Amino acid sequence: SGFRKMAFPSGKVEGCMVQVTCGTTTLNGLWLDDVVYCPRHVICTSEDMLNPNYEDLLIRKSNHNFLVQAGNVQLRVIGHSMQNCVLKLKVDTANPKTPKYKFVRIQPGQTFSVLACYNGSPSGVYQCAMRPNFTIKGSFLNGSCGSVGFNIDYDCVSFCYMHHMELPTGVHAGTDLEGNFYGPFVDRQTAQAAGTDTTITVNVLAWLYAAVINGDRWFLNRFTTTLNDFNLVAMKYNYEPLTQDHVDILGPLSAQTGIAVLDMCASLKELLQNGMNGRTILGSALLEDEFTPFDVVRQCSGVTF
Amino acid sequence: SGFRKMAFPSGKVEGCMVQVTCGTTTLNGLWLDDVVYCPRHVICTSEDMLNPNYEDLLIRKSNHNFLVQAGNVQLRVIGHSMQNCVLKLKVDTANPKTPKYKFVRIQPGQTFSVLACYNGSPSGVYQCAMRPNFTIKGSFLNGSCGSVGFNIDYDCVSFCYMHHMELPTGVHAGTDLEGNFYGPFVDRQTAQAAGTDTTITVNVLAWLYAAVINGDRWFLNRFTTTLNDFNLVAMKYNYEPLTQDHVDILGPLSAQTGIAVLDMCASLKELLQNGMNGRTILGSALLEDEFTPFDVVRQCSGVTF
Ligand SMILES: *C(=C)[C@H](C[C@@H]1CCNC1=O)NC(=O)[C@@H]1[C@@H]2[C@H](CN1C(=O)[C@@H](NC(=O)C(F)(F)F)C(C)(C)C)C2(C)C
Numbered sequence: 276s277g278f279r280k281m282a283f284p285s286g287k288v289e290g291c292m293v294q295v296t297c298g299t300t301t302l303n304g305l306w307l308d309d310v311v312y313c314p315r316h317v318i319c320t321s322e323d324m325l326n327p328n329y330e331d332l333l334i335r336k337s338n339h340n341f342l343v344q345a346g347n348v349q350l351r352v353i354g355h356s357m358q359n360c361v362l363k364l365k366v367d368t369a370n371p372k373t374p375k376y377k378f379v380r381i382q383p384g385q386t387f388s389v390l391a392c393y394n395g396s397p398s399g400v401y402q403c404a405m406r407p408n409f410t411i412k413g414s415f416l417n418g419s420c421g422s423v424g425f426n427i428d429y430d431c432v433s434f435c436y437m438h439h440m441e442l443p444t445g446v447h448a449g450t451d452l453e454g455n456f457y458g459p460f461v462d463r464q465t466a467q468a469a470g471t472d473t474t475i476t477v478n479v480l481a482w483l484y485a486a487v488i489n490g491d492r493w494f495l496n497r498f499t500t501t502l503n504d505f506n507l508v509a510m511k512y513n514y515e516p517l518t519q520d521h522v523d524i525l526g527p528l529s530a531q532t533g534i535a536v537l538d539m540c541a542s543l544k545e546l547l548q549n550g551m552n553g554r555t556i557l558g559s560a561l562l563e564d565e566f567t568p569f570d571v572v573r574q575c576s577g578v579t580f
Numbered sequence: 581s582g583f584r585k586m587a588f589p590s591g592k593v594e595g596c597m598v599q600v601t602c603g604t605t606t607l608n609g610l611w612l613d614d615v616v617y618c619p620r621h622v623i624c625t626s627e628d629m630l631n632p633n634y635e636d637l638l639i640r641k642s643n644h645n646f647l648v649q650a651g652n653v654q655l656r657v658i659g660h661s662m663q664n665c666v667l668k669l670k671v672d673t674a675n676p677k678t679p680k681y682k683f684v685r686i687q688p689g690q691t692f693s694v695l696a697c698y699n700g701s702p703s704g705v706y707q708c709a710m711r712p713n714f715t716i717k718g719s720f721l722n723g724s725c726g727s728v729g730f731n732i733d734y735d736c737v738s739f740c741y742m743h744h745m746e747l748p749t750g751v752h753a754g755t756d757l758e759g760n761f762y763g764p765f766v767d768r769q770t771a772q773a774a775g776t777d778t779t780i781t782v783n784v785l786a787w788l789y790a791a792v793i794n795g796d797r798w799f800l801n802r803f804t805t806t807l808n809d810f811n812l813v814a815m816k817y818n819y820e821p822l823t824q825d826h827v828d829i830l831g832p833l834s835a836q837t838g839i840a841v842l843d844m845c846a847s848l849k850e851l852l853q854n855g856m857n858g859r860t861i862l863g864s865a866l867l868e869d870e871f872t873p874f875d876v877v878r879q880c881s882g883v884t885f
């Protein structure tokens with residue numbers, strides 16, 4: 276029993292991380308096969324930042340202008356190119372620790388693990404969600420860029436995020452591994468602000484089921500609601516619409532606990548209308564929206580990699 | 581910026597985990613050099629559990645009665661012995677992925693990462709604290725025992741916990757890697773209850789400093805207090821005493837922020853006396869006590885391994 280914010284084991288990703296230095300700027304790269312992937316703003320000087328012409332900056336660079344280091348070992352760059360907002364550096368050595376891997380673009384609401392890195396070396400791992408406004412609530416300092424977010428399925432690593440920047444409220448923005456940003460953000464030092472955020476309703480319901488499975492049951496009531504009447508109440512409290520596909524995805528937890536999705540919706544409605552009144556759920560005094568249905572099942576049934 | 585509950589990278593520990601099977605019971609072991617370490621209750625049948633004589637149960641067992649598997653590879657046991665509540669199984673193969681390592685007994689208040697495992701395979705990683713009552717608030721299912729807790733310093737893995745059991749309130753108890761329990765717990769299925777828990781004051785102060793560093797400043801007041809008058813108020817709200825050694829350990833954060841430890845104590849006193857009034861600190865509506873001073877510095881300055 277117990278329920279914790281839990282990350283994927285990071286060992287497969289750890290063997291892929293390298294340091295990339297261009298002039299005076301250092302950040303992290305992902306070494307897979309004989310390619311190193313990193314944010315293109317490595318080629319900017321603390322100067323180019325307000326309005327850079329990346330295509331131009333890259334035309335001046337030769338292979339030797341990129342120093343790539345894997346622990347203590349120098350990797351010679353033998354080719355370079357740009358794809359959207361990431362650089363691909365072709366190196367003379369295939370990484371012998373390359374996992375089985377895919378590149379995926381995740382949707383808002385989905386969770387992943389971040390391996391926070393500095394100077395090509397891991398500092399720590401944590402789990403977060405892709406918010407509806409296309410930001411994440413991470414922990415990233417100067418030098419963190421090129422840190423990656425990932426999921427594991429058995430032995431296949433799904434790379435889904437590479438970190439690029441920090442926005443005013445202390446939230447974070449980055450790209451997929453093909454270099455396209457999540458959200459309306461660009462890689463320049465200019466006035467940018469996150470859209471207002473909403474609460475991921477399907478995940479809050481998944482979390483309420485996790486609470487029942489672990490024996491925290493005080494918030495269950497004897498009523499039901501319709502999907503439509505629930506969605507009126509959700510909108511008022513800045514919650515995403517709940518769709519029929521979300522009800523289908525909650526099917527396994529609903530089955531396991533014997534509580535119909537629309538019955539749990541009635542319980543959430545009363546929590547939103549009446550507050551929690553100093554009581555906690557799973558040790559928390561706020562409703563938690565960074566667990567997917569799949570995350571709940573994984574932790575509560577003990578799936579391994 | 582940002583502050584997250586962050587675990588150590590787990591890759592070094594992942595290469596040490598194996599499956600240990602004795603008769604019908606399977607759990608996890610830690611393979612270091614040519615020794616596998618695991619909880620001794622692997623030699624119990626779902627029967628022996630209420631009151632086992634381990635010394636007796638072990639006398640009946642031969643080397644072949646332990647099946648040890650490392651991924652798909654069989655490790656032959658060539659010797660076995662017991663030390664307190666852990667078995668040491670001598671195997672015919674030295675683990676080629678053995679990290680630099682130490683065994684340490686941690687004190688209450690200290691934090692570590694748990695690599696939750698089933699069938700010798702990692703499920704996830706999370707951070708927790710050794711509570712004052714010598715329990716941890718983890719996430720562990722049937723088959724989790726022998727999962728380990730650890731710290732990293734640069735390249736040295738400090739193993740500090742091996743998981744053995746779950747107590748009534750859904751909290752967890754286990755041993756150091758020499759087999760001695762944390763707290764007054766025994767490895768039998770009998771009526772056991774955690775002592776009442778207290779809040780780790782030094783860690784709550786460390787967390788308030790983390791909040792200032794990240795720009796969350798609303799709770800700072802213009803007053804000071806004495807260590808003695810603070811400690812009267814702490815005791816009333818079930819907080820550990822704050823000692824002069826704890827003030828010395830907070831020295832770096834106090835220096836960095838320019839807020840004297842006793843000034844932050846005055847702020848915490850008002851939070852305890854007057855509540856937080858619907859406001860959050862670092863996104864949280866409760867005071868958080870699972871970050872040590874060292875954890876705050878690490879995350880906020882970007883220390884790597
Ligand atoms: C990567 C090395 C670094 C990571 C930042 C630094 C602090 N925390 C982080 O996550 N990224 C940058 O420095 C990028 C890079 C230059 C400016 N920048 C920013 O993150 C800036 N943010 C913004 O300009 C904006 F989001 F728009 F508000 C900064 C103000 C935090 C420095 C680019 C975008 C090329």
Ligand SMILES: *C(=C)[C@H](C[C@@H]1CCNC1=O)NC(=O)[C@@H]1[C@@H]2[C@H](CN1C(=O)[C@@H](NC(=O)C(F)(F)F)C(C)(C)C)C2(C)C
Nearest residue numbers: 621720721722723725744745746747767768769770772
């Ligand atoms: C390890 C494989 C397993 C891990 C437990 C199972 C559920 N969550 C966990 O962390 N440990 C055990 O099954 C141990 C083992 C038998 C009984 N036991 C317990 O954890 C039990 N707890 C207690 O008896 C007590 F803490 F005292 F209340 C149980 C009731 C949770 C099964 C020993 C201690 C030999």
